[model samples]
Target: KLVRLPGLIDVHVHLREPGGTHKEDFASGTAAALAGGITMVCAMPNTRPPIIDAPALALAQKLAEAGARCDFALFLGASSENAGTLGTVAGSAAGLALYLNETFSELRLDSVVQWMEHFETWPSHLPIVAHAEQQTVAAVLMVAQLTQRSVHICHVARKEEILLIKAAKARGLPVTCEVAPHHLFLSHDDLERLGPGKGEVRPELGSRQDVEALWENMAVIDCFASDHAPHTLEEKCGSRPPPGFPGLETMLPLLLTAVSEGRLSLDDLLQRLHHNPRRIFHLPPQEDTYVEVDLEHEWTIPSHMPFSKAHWTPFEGQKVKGTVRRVVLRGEVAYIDGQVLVPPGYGQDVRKWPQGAVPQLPP
Candidate 1:
């Protein structure tokens, strides 16, 4: 029942340092990723100060260099104020993040001009990751078409959105998108069970049909990201809860369960989790990285053992069929049998390294 696969790369995660460290930080966030068999993560830039330019990006990188336990990259947030100057830090960022709608932070851009500024200013080599909804998805795609720069849509949720992306791909616009596990698995039906506070999330959970559409049009999805946005239990259960979920530790297991149910092939999972993410993000190679999975192991997701300081999950008590037994990153044993052997600061920034040779699979 044991299987070896390429170390997964989650292209979207929120490691809340420089602002929301009390909720999650580099050490705990990356630890959650390793526990879930992810070797590399692209951290979002909507932190306290927001990584809009060199100084904020530097601050996050410093903290990541000091506390991250897995390979990582920091995104430079796009704001009207920094759009013109984003090129200054293009060499160091994982990619540029343009928030077209509201999420945990107030960085949403409502103006097409602002979006254009970012699209035109950011370097062509790096990608622009956007948090766009239905109508916003089309608008962003239009901008992508107009500017002639590739864009990666983040956490795509609805049927209309995915179909739009499909149309764009058919028309040959430079576009790629990611689907979060929460959006694919949890639906509005789970809202009442999640309770009013716990159920809240940006782009909201879609209808069951929306979930079905995502599965039916599986070929359109380019990557599977956790969108690992974490919030403390108190914050989640409070009167005014934030919109996000703690997902790093549950994404792979959920997808594995789906595979077991004949919803998708293992090859399909690997393409989205590893192959497409590396190609879309231009990530550096992890020479000897791979994860060992116990494919037949069935277990309930714990409510509190996760590495994120948030200490809770919407997937609590969910039965999953697979678990990460070991993780080998660049020939180093980073995790094995439920323990993270590597310390903080062990992770290197992906931007710091070149994309060397990708390891060939065993015959």
Candidate 2:
């Protein structure tokens, strides 16, 4: 049956721009989002200038508004450079993107009262989303307890990290976390064939056992983010390849295929994909927004369809079911049948929680 789903909210995506436009930019990134089921995505601030100061943040917002094809929000990159600015202009962004470990952006964060104050700028429900991994994840959790502030752990792939986050929620620390479609769908076993290069992702690809752990604890998983970091074909296959792959066009279909196989229920998928991401980020819904998909659409990827500017994907040539038919944004058909219905500049910035907004959790 054809399914019409509420527009999805993707809170973790690296839409490289104002610097890495050669890999991905606002226009191409948002196009990929609309092509998937996502109507709203919060772009990471690890751009050329990095969204550290007000001027940079403002420029990124303007860039997204001027060219994006889907609803947008930009994150403020947290580092020593922006410690003072965070408290003042923190709300100017959807939330803070704190990288505790070294990665693509080379930014990090930590502290007690000083750090908590920056989070206080926005509503409590809005989280300090952490690129929580290895050492950084633990430190942030400790500080989250110390500050009594909520934190969203991004792209959690480790089994142990899952345990800590699960226990934190049990102890009532307002902790939320996400698993990427890459981790959920891709396995270390597959990596050997694609070679270690294609499997290289932040937090690293977990074993089949680790991937199973995420599914085993699916009830506690709050959101599913694409971690949609796009890189060029050259960059992807290089000896020193970047730490991401193109996923904006593949996340939802893989999840839907999992549902068809009964590995998960559609309800659980919605919570991670739609319900929690929307509420966690306080993204307002457009009255007439939705994503239409063919539940039975099946094909091999490395697809002939439209794609991001990165022009590369590790998921290339993978078989999958479910495909996006169209995407509607704010009552207007933005994308359909490979055609763009809504043009650029149609997407609005989304950063506020609508009155009385709440996310549905798996029971």
Candidate 3:
């Protein structure tokens, strides 16, 4: 019998829509998530309209309702200026997504204290997922320290940052972190291997040393998310002003390959990709959701990422060791034998930490 696993949970992804639908919308993005063996994903609020208020939050839900193909949770974008709505809208979201550095959305939180003030308004139980890198992470950690609120660092790429986060966790701070597949699987050296077409990535690639440390510390890292940012080929074709890669389609297979080689255990793989994320984000378990894989199957990520409209990935042609054999969402078979068995919208919306019920996490 093929090994079965709880459906993967990716708490980080930039599902470009509302303005950048040409690149990806809920339908295409969630389809890509399913193909990647992910049953649930928390969509980031870095959209064109920038989900900063209750209305923007409402609009995103409307769009997800009409287009999403997998269970989804929306993170409201937090800015220094949104304090007016913080009490009203912030608590309703899965959590706030704060950018200490800029990406597609104009980087806000002009001053560190300006952002920290916003933290006081966030619900104590919910987390503030931060997009902080090397130097940036230190500053945000201080905020989490001063405010004593939980913070989750996203796509940590440097050993310097990881250690700081490690120390924070040790100090009894409510701190957790995620290492993206790109940061774990691809590094600075790989950029030269692909040369010109290698897409620009934000929080860019780190050294082989940094990548290796991530693998060595997987036991401590809380989750494995796609940070599935997508940009059209035309965007990356030239200077690629935007920096991101389509990750939903390639994240799991690469990690599974590492598992096959004894880099980590299957149980470690399941918890980081599935279980821990549910607890960190406070998402209720899709208990019936599961996926099956063939440990013997070997494959490579395609240059043409057919699963996403972005149509490209940083892992183009990278060989990998395992393959997903089946992906069941909720109680229905969504993918099996290389086919998507369900239509878009079969997946439901993932609610924020508020139903006043927090399930205990697996020890």
Best by TM-score: 1
**Candidate 2 — which pairs collide?**
none
Cα lDDT for residue 38, model 1? Answer: 97
Kindly list the per-residue Cα lDDT of model 3 for residues 1-363, writing each as its tens digit: 578888788999999978899889888888888888898888899898998889988999888877877788888888767854666665457788888887434537778877777677776667689888778888888888788677899988888888887877777888889988888877778877756555477778888999988887776699998889887888777764577878888888888888879989988888898778877877777767788887878777777765789887778778897787889876778877656777866665666434423443444
Candidate with the larger TM-score of 1 and 2: 1
Q: What lDDT score belongs to each candidate, Candidate 1 first?
A: 0.86, 0.77, 0.80
lDDT by residue (1-363, candidate 2, tens digit) is 698888888888999988998888888888888888888888888888888778898899888888888877788887755665555566657788777666444464445444555565444544588876866677777777766678888888878889888887887778889889888877877786668666668878888888888989897789988888888767777798778867888888788888899998887788888888767776666678888888887888864237588776667778888989988777667877876777778887775434323243443
81, model 3: CA deviation in Å?
1.3
Candidate 3 clash pair list: none
lDDT of 1: 0.86
Per-residue alpha-carbon lDDT of candidate 1 for residues 37-147, written as tens digits (9 for 90 to 100):
999998999899888889888989899999989999888888767777866678688888888887434576658988998888787667788988879888888888788
Off by over 4 Å in 2: 103-106, 109-125, 303-305, 352-363
* CA lDDT for candidate 2: 0.77
Best by lDDT: 1
